Structures are given as C-alpha cells and as structure tokens.
Amino acid sequence: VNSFSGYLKLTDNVYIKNADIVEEAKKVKPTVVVNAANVYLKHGGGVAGALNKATNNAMQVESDDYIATNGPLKVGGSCVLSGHNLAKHCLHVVGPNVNKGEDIQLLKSAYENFNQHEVLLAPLLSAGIFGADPIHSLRVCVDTVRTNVYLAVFDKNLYDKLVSSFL
Numbered sequence: 001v002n003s004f005s006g007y008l009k010l011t012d013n014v015y016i017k018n019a020d021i022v023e024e025a026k027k028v029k030p031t032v033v034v035n036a037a038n039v040y041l042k043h044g045g046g047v048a049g050a051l052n053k054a055t056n057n058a059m060q061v062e063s064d065d066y067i068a069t070n071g072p073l074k075v076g077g078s079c080v081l082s083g084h085n086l087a088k089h090c091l092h093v094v095g096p097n098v099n100k101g102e103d104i105q106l107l108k109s110a111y112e113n114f115n116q117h118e119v120l121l122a123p124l125l126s127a128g129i130f131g132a133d134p135i136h137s138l139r140v141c142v143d144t145v146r147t148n149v150y151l152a153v154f155d156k157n158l159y160d161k162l163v164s165s166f167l
C-alpha cells in the first residue's frame with residue numbers, strides 16, 4: 001500500500017491523475033519525483049520551472065553545482081539529486097525536445113531511467129513545452145516502465161483525452 005490517492009489505474013503498474021505535480025509532491029512527499037529536465041538542468045519553464053519555483057530556487061542552485069562538476073546530461077539520460085521540500089529525491093530525466101529537433105526514439109531511453117526506482121511520481125516525458133504528442137508519451141511509458149509510476153497531468157482537458165483514448 002502507498003499514499004497516492006485519486007489515481008485511475010491504467011495497467012498493473014501505471015496510474016494517472018489530473019493533478020498539479022508541485023501540489024501532489026507537497027502532499028505525498030514521495031521517495032522520487034521526476035523532473036522534466038533539459039541537459040543543462042536549466043529549470044526555466046514547464047514542470048522544471050514549476051518544481052524549481054516550489055523549492056525557492058534551491059533545485060537550480062544544486063543543479064548548477066552538479067553541471068559545473070559533471071557537465072551536461074545526455075538526451076535520454078538522468079541524474080538523481082535532492083527532492084528538497086517536495087520529495088526525498090528528484091530524478092531529473094531528459095526526454096527529447098521536439099521544439100529542438102531531438103530524436104523521439106530517445107523517449108523510450110528516457111523512460112527506462114524510471115525502472116531504477118520502485119515507485120515514482122512523474123509527468124509525461126517530452127509533453128508540454130517539449131513538443132511531443134502526450135498520447136504517444138503515455139504509450140511509451142506503459143510499454144517501457146515496469147516499476148510503479150503515478151503520472152500527474154496538469155491539463156484537465158488533456159487528462160480526459162489521455163484516459164478516453166487509452167488502449
């Protein structure tokens with residue numbers, strides 16, 4: 001049993017809810033929240049900007065030190081950093097950004113990072129300002145992630161479309 005509430009069950013391991021990810025993390029304090037990161041960990045907008053704002057910029061400060069030491073992530077890659085006030089850990093995952101011309105095949109590689117964690121609160125990778133089709137992102141998630149993933153979808157309209165169209 002876990003603390004996640006109000007989710008619709010899509011599969012054995014994937015759950016979905018219309019929820020503000022900042023507000024869901026604050027309520028649950030999950031072991032892992034996933035950030036929709038870029039390779040520079042520049043958390044300016046979307047999931048990354050909202051999560052970072054909720055940490056009072058402490059996520060960005062920590063991220064800048066990580067990049068100064070390690071250099072940029074790979075598209076499809078990830079790193080584990082603090083969850084600050086939102087979670088124990090934040091898994092920063094880089095999905096491909098279609099608005100930069102990145103290979104959508106890298107979306108499966110991105111979701112494979114989730115398999116290193118037994119339970120996660122996450123957004124749909126490469127959705128929103130990353131430009132991918134969220135219906136596609138949900139299909140890749142279901143077909144790639146084997147661990148237990150609780151997906152928060154910001155747009156009620158999109159949430160209802162993801163559920164209604166789910167195979």
Ligand SMILES: O=c1[nH]ccc2ccccc12
Pocket residue numbers: 020021022045046047050128154
């Ligand atoms: O701006 C946001 N606040 C809280 C959640 C969120 C999720 C996706 C994109 C933007 C936001």
